[PDB]
Structure 1
Amino acid sequence: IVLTQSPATLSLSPGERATLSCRASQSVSSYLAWYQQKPGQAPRLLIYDASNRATGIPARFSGSGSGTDFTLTISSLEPEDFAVYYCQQYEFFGQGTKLEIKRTVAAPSVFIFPPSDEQLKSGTASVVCLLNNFYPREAKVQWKVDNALQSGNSQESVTEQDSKDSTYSLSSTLTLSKADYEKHKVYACEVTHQGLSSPVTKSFNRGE
């Protein structure tokens, strides 16, 4: 048996009604719990035994369903309700639904940083590209070194959605040997995002 939650991500504005689904791949029980989890916190029990609100949980939360189809409904979202939600029965957890805040589209502000002189002293060069305060979360970074598209040599990470402005930020690091870095001149990161009518490229010339 598997518990399947949908949607994977639900994007709604505060005040709207949220409906989250949890479907069991086979009948396991009509007991089902829902949990809420915020970043860096333990999960919190919201609904128990399918349809009961846990203590201290506000009335806007309700659960329903039986058999293999269950639903968590939040009548009208409050700011504190944006979080990840998991369903569970016996040993089984669903994979989670991320309930995120929908806000106006915001293009990233893009910045590029050369390797520091300090770092270069040690054989490695890291080039960093920052995409700042954008929405929605989906964004693409492409690195170019002397106009050659890079692959296989970068890593990135994305912040949790900001609790105050509802944006995301992203950091990408291109890793090169110091020799390769000193060998080439033009370093560029090209960013694609819904908020940009065409890709933006931030660049620098090494040594200049």
Structure 2
Amino acid sequence: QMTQSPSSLSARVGDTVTITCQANGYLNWYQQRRGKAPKLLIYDGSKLERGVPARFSGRRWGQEYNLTINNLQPEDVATYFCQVYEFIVPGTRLDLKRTVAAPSVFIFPPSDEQLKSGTASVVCLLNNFYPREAKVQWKVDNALQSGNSQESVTEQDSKDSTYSLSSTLTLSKADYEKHKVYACEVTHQGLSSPVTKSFNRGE
């Protein structure tokens, strides 16, 4: 009964990472790039697939299958998973490690051009942070909104190894005008203290 560990890995270029499944049978490991089709890395436990760098390898011992990547490279950033017949584990995200970086935080009041449509959209931007786990909080007049939010995050950036996140608080024309202070409050590893960027009518 097959599991994989862990769910997320960050590693430095040149380092070695190991990913484990618990399973039984003829097992294969695949690499899958965020937006793409899988690629076979190892078949049948430990056989390296033709055309794949020997810095990939696989070890079976009982019900334990390790996939190991040695000398990790920038192109190794992907999700990895094991598969036995019809069963494919959900897999492990691998990202490149870099120095911790707190989000550049910003807020964006609704555009008046848009209020003309009856729907208002407040936006929050967390820019270039690492690692990628983060928490946005939408506050207005200290009210805590608990439905009515979207969130979107970029892939790790191929240059500065950061992530960015956008969160859209969409609320109707009326209930918007009725309140004053709109703050965005985000909590991230690299931030000593949850910090807020907050607007209201003074422009």
Which residue number in structure 1 is paired with residue 42 of structure 2?
A: 47
The match for 1:6 is: 5
Q: Which amino acid aligns with 1:185?
A: K
Change (3 A) 1:193 1:158: same
| Equivalences, count | 203
Deviation at 1:207, TM superposition (A): 6.0
Alpha-carbon offset, residue 66 of structure 1: 4.8
RMSD, aligned α-carbons: 1.3
Note the 1:59-74 alignment, pairs <5 A.
59-74=54-69
Q: What are the superposed Cα offsets for residues 57-89 of structure 1, whole Å, 9 maximum, x if unpaired?
A: 001001110542111111210111111001001
Runs of 4+ in 1 over 2 A off after TM superposition: none
Gaps of 5+ in 1: none
Aligned mates of 1:89, 1:176 — CA distance in 2: 46
1:12·1:102 contact (CA, 8 Å) conserved in 2? Answer: yes
The answer to whether the 8 A contact 1:141-1:192 is kept is yes
Determine the C-alpha separation between the residues in 1 that align with 2:117 and 2:95: 42
Residue 83 of structure 2 is matched in structure 1 by: 88
Which amino acid letter does the alignment assign opposite residue 65 of structure 2?
F
Letter in structure 1 aligned against 2:19: L
Name structure 2 gaps, 5 residues minimum: none
> Aligned partners of 1:51, 1:197: CA distance in 2, in Å?
44
CA contact (8 A) 1:187 1:206 kept: no
Please tell me whether residue 100 in structure 1 is matched to residue 109 in structure 2. no
Q: Deviations over 1:35-61 (max 9, x none)?
A: 001111100001011111111100100
- C-alpha spacing 1:64/1:17, structure 2 compared with 1 (3 Å): same
Q: SS state of the match for residue 180, structure 1?
A: helix
Does 1:121 pair with 2:116?
Answer: yes
Partner Cα distance (2:156, 2:27) in 1:
28
| Alignment-mate amino acid for residue 160 of structure 1 | E
TM-score by length of 2: 0.95
Instruction: Measure how far apart 1:131 and its partner are.
Output: 0.2
Cα deviation digits, residues 120-148 of structure 1 (max 9, x gap): 11111010000000011121111111222
Give, in angstroms, the shift of residue 149 of structure 1: 2.0
| Structure 2 residue 32 is matched with structure 1 residue 37 | yes
Q: Establish whether residue 170 from structure 1 lines up as the match of residue 165 from structure 2.
A: yes
Who is 1:145 aligned against?
A: 140
- Per the normalisation by structure 1, the TM-score is 0.93
- Are the counterparts in 2 of residues 35 and 87 from structure 1 also a CA contact under 8 Å? yes
Residue 182 (structure 1) aligned with residue 177 (structure 2): yes
Partners in 2 of 1:138 and 1:55 — Cα distance?
36
- Equivalent pair of 1:124/1:175 in contact (CA under 8 Å): yes
Aligned mates of 1:50, 1:146 — CA distance in 2? 57
* 3-state DSSP of counterpart to 2:75: helix
